[PDB]
Write an enzyme that holds these catalytic residues in place. Structure first.
Site, PDB file in Angstrom:
ATOM      1  CG  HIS A 209      34.179  31.574  33.811  1.00 37.21           C
ATOM      2  ND1 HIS A 209      35.513  31.213  33.806  1.00 37.21           N
ATOM      3  CD2 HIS A 209      34.132  32.926  33.758  1.00 37.21           C
ATOM      4  CE1 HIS A 209      36.246  32.304  33.716  1.00 37.21           C
ATOM      5  NE2 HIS A 209      35.417  33.372  33.688  1.00 37.21           N
TER       6      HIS A 209
HETATM    7  C1  LIG Z   1      33.206  38.055  39.669  1.00 38.80           C
HETATM    8  C2  LIG Z   1      33.989  38.020  38.387  1.00 38.80           C
HETATM    9  C3  LIG Z   1      33.416  37.517  37.223  1.00 38.80           C
HETATM   10  C4  LIG Z   1      34.111  37.541  35.992  1.00 38.80           C
HETATM   11  C5  LIG Z   1      35.424  38.060  35.981  1.00 38.80           C
HETATM   12  C6  LIG Z   1      35.992  38.526  37.183  1.00 38.80           C
HETATM   13  C7  LIG Z   1      35.301  38.516  38.368  1.00 38.80           C
HETATM   14  C8  LIG Z   1      35.958  39.024  39.622  1.00 38.80           C
HETATM   15  N1  LIG Z   1      36.187  38.139  34.845  1.00 38.80           N
HETATM   16  C9  LIG Z   1      35.650  37.747  33.723  1.00 38.80           C
HETATM   17  C10 LIG Z   1      36.415  37.851  32.519  1.00 38.80           C
HETATM   18  O1  LIG Z   1      37.556  38.307  32.486  1.00 38.80           O
HETATM   19  N2  LIG Z   1      35.821  37.437  31.353  1.00 38.80           N
HETATM   20  C11 LIG Z   1      34.566  36.915  31.337  1.00 38.80           C
HETATM   21  O2  LIG Z   1      34.119  36.543  30.245  1.00 38.80           O
HETATM   22  N3  LIG Z   1      33.828  36.780  32.466  1.00 38.80           N
HETATM   23  C12 LIG Z   1      34.327  37.188  33.608  1.00 38.80           C
HETATM   24  N4  LIG Z   1      33.578  37.092  34.777  1.00 38.80           N
HETATM   25  C13 LIG Z   1      32.223  36.512  34.731  1.00 38.80           C
HETATM   26  C14 LIG Z   1      31.207  37.398  34.058  1.00 38.80           C
HETATM   27  O3  LIG Z   1      30.940  38.584  34.821  1.00 38.80           O
HETATM   28  C15 LIG Z   1      29.905  36.614  33.849  1.00 38.80           C
HETATM   29  O4  LIG Z   1      30.083  35.434  33.056  1.00 38.80           O
HETATM   30  C16 LIG Z   1      28.838  37.487  33.199  1.00 38.80           C
HETATM   31  O5  LIG Z   1      28.555  38.590  34.072  1.00 38.80           O
HETATM   32  C17 LIG Z   1      27.587  36.702  32.879  1.00 38.80           C
HETATM   33  O6  LIG Z   1      26.729  37.623  32.172  1.00 38.80           O
HETATM   34  P1  LIG Z   1      25.148  37.501  32.314  1.00 38.80           P
HETATM   35  O7  LIG Z   1      24.580  38.798  31.809  1.00 38.80           O
HETATM   36  O8  LIG Z   1      24.734  36.142  31.807  1.00 38.80           O
HETATM   37  O9  LIG Z   1      24.955  37.459  33.891  1.00 38.80           O
HETATM   38  P2  LIG Z   1      25.339  38.477  35.041  1.00 38.80           P
HETATM   39  O10 LIG Z   1      26.373  39.424  34.517  1.00 38.80           O
HETATM   40  O11 LIG Z   1      25.613  37.588  36.222  1.00 38.80           O
HETATM   41  O12 LIG Z   1      23.983  39.306  35.247  1.00 38.80           O
HETATM   42  C18 LIG Z   1      22.796  38.590  35.674  1.00 38.80           C
HETATM   43  C19 LIG Z   1      21.728  39.594  36.034  1.00 38.80           C
HETATM   44  O13 LIG Z   1      20.474  38.907  36.292  1.00 38.80           O
HETATM   45  C20 LIG Z   1      19.839  39.497  37.398  1.00 38.80           C
HETATM   46  N5  LIG Z   1      18.945  38.508  38.011  1.00 38.80           N
HETATM   47  C21 LIG Z   1      19.278  37.260  38.478  1.00 38.80           C
HETATM   48  N6  LIG Z   1      18.245  36.613  38.973  1.00 38.80           N
HETATM   49  C22 LIG Z   1      17.177  37.481  38.807  1.00 38.80           C
HETATM   50  C23 LIG Z   1      15.811  37.366  39.124  1.00 38.80           C
HETATM   51  N7  LIG Z   1      15.278  36.287  39.691  1.00 38.80           N
HETATM   52  N8  LIG Z   1      15.015  38.423  38.831  1.00 38.80           N
HETATM   53  C24 LIG Z   1      15.569  39.500  38.253  1.00 38.80           C
HETATM   54  N9  LIG Z   1      16.838  39.718  37.910  1.00 38.80           N
HETATM   55  C25 LIG Z   1      17.598  38.653  38.218  1.00 38.80           C
HETATM   56  C26 LIG Z   1      20.971  39.974  38.296  1.00 38.80           C
HETATM   57  O14 LIG Z   1      20.514  41.040  39.094  1.00 38.80           O
HETATM   58  C27 LIG Z   1      22.025  40.433  37.284  1.00 38.80           C
HETATM   59  O15 LIG Z   1      21.917  41.813  36.963  1.00 38.80           O
HETATM   60  O1  LIG Z   2      37.445  35.671  34.215  1.00 40.24           O
HETATM   61  C1  LIG Z   2      37.968  35.873  35.292  1.00 40.24           C
HETATM   62  O2  LIG Z   2      38.989  36.893  35.359  1.00 40.24           O
HETATM   63  C2  LIG Z   2      40.136  36.646  36.184  1.00 40.24           C
HETATM   64  C3  LIG Z   2      41.189  36.259  35.149  1.00 40.24           C
HETATM   65  O3  LIG Z   2      42.285  35.544  35.720  1.00 40.24           O
HETATM   66  C4  LIG Z   2      39.914  35.663  37.361  1.00 40.24           C
HETATM   67  O4  LIG Z   2      40.587  36.159  38.536  1.00 40.24           O
HETATM   68  C5  LIG Z   2      38.439  35.468  37.737  1.00 40.24           C
HETATM   69  O5  LIG Z   2      38.296  34.444  38.736  1.00 40.24           O
HETATM   70  C6  LIG Z   2      37.549  35.128  36.530  1.00 40.24           C
HETATM   71  O6  LIG Z   2      36.177  35.472  36.803  1.00 40.24           O
END
Ligand SMILES: *Cc1cc2c(cc1C)nc1c(=O)[nH]c(=O)nc-1n2C[C@H](O)[C@H](O)[C@H](O)COP(=O)(O)OP(=O)(O)OC[C@H]1O[C@@H](n2cnc3c(N)ncnc32)[C@H](O)[C@@H]1O
Ligand SMILES: O=C1O[C@H](CO)[C@@H](O)[C@H](O)[C@H]1O
Ligand code: F3S
Lengths: 531, 114
Positions: A468
């Site tokens: 997050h």
């Molecule tokens: C790893 C993870 C994350 C996660 C989760 C479980 C795991 C294992 N479970 C979640 C959950 O149950 N509920 C939730 O709300 N979030 C959960 N997360 C986190 C979630 O994936 C992130 O908060 C979310 O993905 C954030 O969304 P956002 O669209 O803001 O960002 P992103 O998904 O990280 O995508 C960012 C994109 O930007 C591109 N990028 C980055 N830098 C650049 C540059 N310089 N130039 C061009 N493109 C760029 C990246 O490639 C990416 O596609």
């Molecule tokens: O939102 C999430 O989903 C999972 C919920 O517990 C947790 O394992 C990850 O670390 C977190 O990114």
């Protein structure tokens, strides 16, 4: 064209879709490559550690991303604690691999400082977001419970879908826990996952693979809104890692410069600019875009870009219950304990949400047996596999951490990826705020154990990442301790917006991606007004 | 009796399962022959001791290495097989293999029987 969006994540694709549907012309720039799901699935089946959720998404040399089995060392983590959080750098971004938990924040969460004295309030209040939360819930395809369970976020419409039945695991525990103390308030978790055919995607079949991929896309992935925004008329150029926003003679942005997989520099001009690059790569384009009239790095005349960076410090317990429960039947998480999400104490401690795992434990419990280095007859072996993988229960939580400007991300003076772009240098610490909650969090665990006939009780007291990546461009009142206005527009550049959790002055007690989609829809509305 | 013949009969004893793939058996043998079975005597010898009598802590260590490879399906942090790993087969009635649906509605609300 009219609007340039950097980041094909959920945040970027929602915006790109909204504005491309309004007939207006859009360019979506993605750092990483376009990889389909059948590929992620195959890389998943072929990977030796099925707990490593970053492992089936290749860290491209031109657009790297954090790996930890083994470490690829892409992030420089100095400080007193590792900000070893995960994110994907490909079309669709990190919602490829999430658990699709889709919560709203509660009312206090926005007025933390006023209510509790700690932390730091938002410009906007719960009720400016509520109608935007609801469309988020419809757009992702969120299931959650009806009025039999208060989640404490005042609803106007009901959840687009109902939950599917809890697993024997999650239901039995919900009953036992709420029967020991109803303050705990174990509820069904709202989730971007289908209980019926919905927005073209199928219903959830119980793959138990939510992280790191669905084979069928029963749960929401950002790639949904990319393929949408594309059908609306947005132009997808992938392998376009943006390193610079150029300012012009009106204190306004005028182009974004980006390198391809070769390192060959390209330029794209637009009327408006949305930055949706997760809460690290986003500041890292800001501080790296320093120039003549903007010394201290683009949009950063507050010194606040990259600072007050937050995530939810995690703490867990494991044990074998006395009763067979069979984790790994249905979705990985269906149930959360929200009794501590709010209250008086949040002026002393961090609040938490605790959650029971419903993750398959055969691999873990079979490995464990073979480490005992004792050969057993096939029948004892199989018995013990079924018994252990049947009784294992694991708990995990998200503690809140408050927005401290010491905790921050900066581009590296020294370190560089394979194409010249400096690298994230996160500094981060966990104060007694978070730790004093976690001591109580760990009494809840000790109790939960005792309720469920807990044997082999291990406390996991090392704070774990939780992905997050929030606060890095904090939104606020005026531009002299804030980066963005209540509309998530940058105080400095009138045609620059930040679609990301970077814009969130508080991380709260829950997965933040719903709130990201709330603001992404809210912003898309605002920008549609502008010609 | 090539290395495969002996491997495959050892495996039928150690695992107790009849009809183990020789297409997978060959792959586990070849993978294991990176780090184990350096002698051409170790396998016939382990088959003998495992038959009537007892094992040395080093023979029982090898038996385990063989069982471990059929159950987890991984040798030296490399997946040899995912779907045909034996541990999955032991709980097939109740648990799925992550990323493969049951052909049913799943129905996970029931308490598994036995
Ligand atoms: C790893 C993870 C994350 C996660 C989760 C479980 C795991 C294992 N479970 C979640 C959950 O149950 N509920 C939730 O709300 N979030 C959960 N997360 C986190 C979630 O994936 C992130 O908060 C979310 O993905 C954030 O969304 P956002 O669209 O803001 O960002 P992103 O998904 O990280 O995508 C960012 C994109 O930007 C591109 N990028 C980055 N830098 C650049 C540059 N310089 N130039 C061009 N493109 C760029 C990246 O490639 C990416 O596609
Ligand atoms: O939102 C999430 O989903 C999972 C919920 O517990 C947790 O394992 C990850 O670390 C977190 O990114
Ligand atoms: S991966 Fe897919 S089918 Fe259901 S349990 Fe998770 S969503």
């Amino acid at each position: 064209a009219d609007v340039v969006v950097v980041g094909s994540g959920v945040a970027g694709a929602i915006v790109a879709h909204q504005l491309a549907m309004a007939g207006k012309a859009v360019i979506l720039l993605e750092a990483g490559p376009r990889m389909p799901r059948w590929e992620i699935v195959e890389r998943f089946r072929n990977q030796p550690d099925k707990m490593d959720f970053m492992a089936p998404y290749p860290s491209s040399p031109w657009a790297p991303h954090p790996e930890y089995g083994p470490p690829n060392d892409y992030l420089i983590l100095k400080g007193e604690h590792k900000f070893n959080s995960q994110y994907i750098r490909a079309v669709g971004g990190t919602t490829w691999h999430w658990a699709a938990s889709a919560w709203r924040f509660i009312p206090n969460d926005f007025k933390m400082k006023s209510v509790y004295g700690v932390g730091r309030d938002w410009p906007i209040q719960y009720d400016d977001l509520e109608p935007y939360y609801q469309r988020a819930e419809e757009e992702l395809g969120v299931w959650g419970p009806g009025p039999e369970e208060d989640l404490y976020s005042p609803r106007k419409q009901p959840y687009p879908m109902p939950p599917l039945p809890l697993s024997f695991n999650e239901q039995t525990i919900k009953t036992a826990l709420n029967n020991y103390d109803p303050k705990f308030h174990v509820v069904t978790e709202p989730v971007a996952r289908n209980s019926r055919p919905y927005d073209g995607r199928p219903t959830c079949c119980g793959n138990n693979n939510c992280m790191p991929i669905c084979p069928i896309g029963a749960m929401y992935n950002g790639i949904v809104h990319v393929e949408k925004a594309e059908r609306a008329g947005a132009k997808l150029i992938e392998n376009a890692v943006v390193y610079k926003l150029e300012t012009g003679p009106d204190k306004r942005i005028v182009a974004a410069l980006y390198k391809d997989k070769t390192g060959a520099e390209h330029r794209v001009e637009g009327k408006y600019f949305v930055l949706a690059a997760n809460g690290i790569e986003t500041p890292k384009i800001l501080l790296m875009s320093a120039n003549r009239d903007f010394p201290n790095g683009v949009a950063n005349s507050s010194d606040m870009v990259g600072r007050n960076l937050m995530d939810h410090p995690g703490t867990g317990v494991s044990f074998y219950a006395s009763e067979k429960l069979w984790p790994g039947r249905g979705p990985q998480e269906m149930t959360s304990l929200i009794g501590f999400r709010d209250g008086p104490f949040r002026a002393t401690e961090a609040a938490k949400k605790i959650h029971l795992s419903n993750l398959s434990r055969i691999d873990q419990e079979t490995q464990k047996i073979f480490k005992a280095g004792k050969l057993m007859k096939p029948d004892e072996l199989d018995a013990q596999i079924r018994d252990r993988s049947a009784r294992y229960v694991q708990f995990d939580c998200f503690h809140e951490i408050l927005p401290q400007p010491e905790n921050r991300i900066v581009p590296s003076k020294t370190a560089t990826d394979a194409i010249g772009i400096p690298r994230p240098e996160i500094t981060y610490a966990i104060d007694d705020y978070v730790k004093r909650g976690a001591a109580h969090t760990r009494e809840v665990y000790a109790t939960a154990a005792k309720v469920l006939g807990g044997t082999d009780v291990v406390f996991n007291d090392e704070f774990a990442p939780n992905n997050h990546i929030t606060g890095s461009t904090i939104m606020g009142a005026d531009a002299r301790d804030s980066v963005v206005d209540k509309d998530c527009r940058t105080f400095d550049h009138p045609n620059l917006f930040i679609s990301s959790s970077a814009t969130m002055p508080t991380v709260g007690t829950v997965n933040v991606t719903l709130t990201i989609a709330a603001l992404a829809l809210r912003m898309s509305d605002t920008l549609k007004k502008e010609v | 009796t090539a290395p495969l013949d002996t491997f495959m009969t050892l495996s039928e004893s150690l695992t107790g399962k009849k009809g183990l793939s020789r297409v997978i058996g060959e792959r586990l043998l070849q993978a294991l022959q990176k780090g184990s079975f350096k002698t051409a005597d170790s396998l016939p010898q382990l088959a003998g001791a495992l038959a009537s009598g007892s094992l040395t802590p080093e023979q029982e260590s090898l038996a385990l290495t063989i069982l471990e490879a059929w159950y987890l399906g991984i040798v030296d942090n490399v997946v040899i097989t995912y779907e045909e790993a034996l541990m999955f087969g032991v709980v097939s009635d109740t648990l799925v293999i992550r990323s493969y649906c049951p052909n049913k509605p799943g129905f996970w609300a029931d308490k598994p029987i036995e």
